[PDB]
Design a protein around this ligand. Sequence first.
Ligand SMILES: Nc1nc(Nc2ccc(S(N)(=O)=O)cc2)nn1C(=O)c1c(F)cccc1F
Length: 272
Amino acid sequence: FHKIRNEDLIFNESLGQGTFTKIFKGVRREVGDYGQLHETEVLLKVLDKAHRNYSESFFEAASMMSKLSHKHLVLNYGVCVCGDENILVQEFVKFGSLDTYLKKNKNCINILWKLEVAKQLAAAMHFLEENTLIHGNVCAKNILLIREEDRKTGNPPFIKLSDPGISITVLPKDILQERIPWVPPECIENPKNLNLATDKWSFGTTLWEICSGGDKPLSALDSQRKLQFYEDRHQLPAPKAAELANLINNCMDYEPDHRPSFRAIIRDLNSL
Ligand SMILES: Nc1nc(Nc2ccc(S(N)(=O)=O)cc2)nn1C(=O)c1c(F)cccc1F
């Protein structure tokens, strides 16, 4: 990972929180191509000092996303570990997280938009599966909108997948339970069961989000009732716009070995 100096980073407005992290929009002063000076918008993820003991996992996440290069994977510029800080320096995606966008733009997102976004995410996950690289936290909040759909020029929307953050393999059990139903049942049973099939399940949950105008599945259930939801083998209800409900349920198969490959997922999406 490229080391960025604290003096080249300016912290601006807060953009919320992650798991044991605080998030800020910022600026990186840098020498760019041809020796030109740039002051570039960046996204700064800051591990909580009180949780410094997660630093390794915190950075492993980013390392995962930077192992390979792909048009649908967020770019990491580097890290800042000056002083007592553990900072990830990431590309700033103009239009933010997909769940927020879906909530704010419900009455203007049709099935074609959601189908294109789903195909793009499936392409990213197929790229990861071919490379046998586990993401571990596919969710609408970790999908970032680079470009809005412009039906006046035919331009589709364009999305990227962000980093998964601290792995579910080291997170406390109560956080994992709160992450039902993105975390698959075999990972509630044993977080060391993290596997490629995990991302197929979570991809299903993410499709549910995309089709549900940004609602969170099972948000009305507390952690104990989410646990029991998995124990009684329930599936998510079909979204009102149910065009993708069969694919959602096929991805959210309680048998991990039965979840379809992302190539079959993509064929399914293209058939619609
Ligand atoms: N890499 C990245 N870029 C952005 N851009 C962004 C974020 C929020 C807004 S706004 N005004 O709240 O709607 C506008 C632009 N986010 N981002 C992330 O990794 C990220 C994430 F994945 C989840 C949550 C927060 C994040 F910050």
